[PDB]
Amino acid sequence: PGVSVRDVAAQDFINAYASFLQRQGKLEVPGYVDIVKTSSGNEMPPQDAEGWFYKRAASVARHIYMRKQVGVGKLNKLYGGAKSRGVRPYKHIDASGSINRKVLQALEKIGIVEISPKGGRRISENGQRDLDRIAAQTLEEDE
């Protein structure tokens, strides 16, 4: 009768969590969120005007769950697209770093994820008793 993080939905679990984070408002949201898109390869700032900053910040916590450590180079090489070059053939996307640098630092203020001695930023017992516990709060969304 007790779950881990591993036995919930994938897309839906972020949605219920970030909407709770939408009620929180405890995020250092910088001024240039209106202008700067996610990478260079994308064409437009997203159709979400507000909750996209809640979206990426939720899922980066979701990805360090199963993992040991995450630096910043990894989630650069992650984020789901293909660079168009015009009339020349395509190439893989690489993501921007400034929009990921602060949002990784934006969870140290709330006790989630911190630097491992091996060299990456990882969850400890701060999230391991709370982030699972609010993932356990997503079990109410299962019914």
Partner RNA sequence: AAUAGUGGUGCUAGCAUUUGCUGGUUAUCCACUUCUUAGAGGGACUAUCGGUUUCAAGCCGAUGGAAGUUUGAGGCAAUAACAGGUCUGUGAUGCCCUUAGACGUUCUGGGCCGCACGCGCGCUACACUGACGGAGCCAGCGAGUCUAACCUUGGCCGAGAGGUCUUGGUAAUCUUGUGAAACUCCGUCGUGCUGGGGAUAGAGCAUUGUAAUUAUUGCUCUUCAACGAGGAAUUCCUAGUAAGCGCAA
- Rg over alpha carbons for the chain, rounded to the nearest Å, is 16
Tell me which residues in 2-21 interact with other proteins (CB under 8 A): 6-7, 9-10
Q: Which of 132, 14, 120 is nearest to 74 (CA)?
A: 120
125: contact with other proteins by CB under 8 A: no
Tell me which residues in 80-99 interact with RNA (CB under 7 A): 80-82, 84-94, 96-99
Which partner in other proteins, RNA, none is near 72 (CB below 5 to 8 A by kind)? RNA
Report d(CA 67, CA 36) in Å as an integer. 29
Number of residues that bind other proteins (CB under 8 A): 13
Q: Binding pattern to RNA, positions 53-72, x when CB under 7 A?
A: --xx--x--xx--xxx-xxx
Rounded (5°) CA angle 120-5-116: 15
Please, which residues have CB within 8 angstroms of residue 79's CB and are 6 or more apart in sequence? 38, 39, 93, 95
Binding interface with other proteins (CB under 8 A): 6-7, 9-10, 31-32, 34-35, 43-45, 49, 66
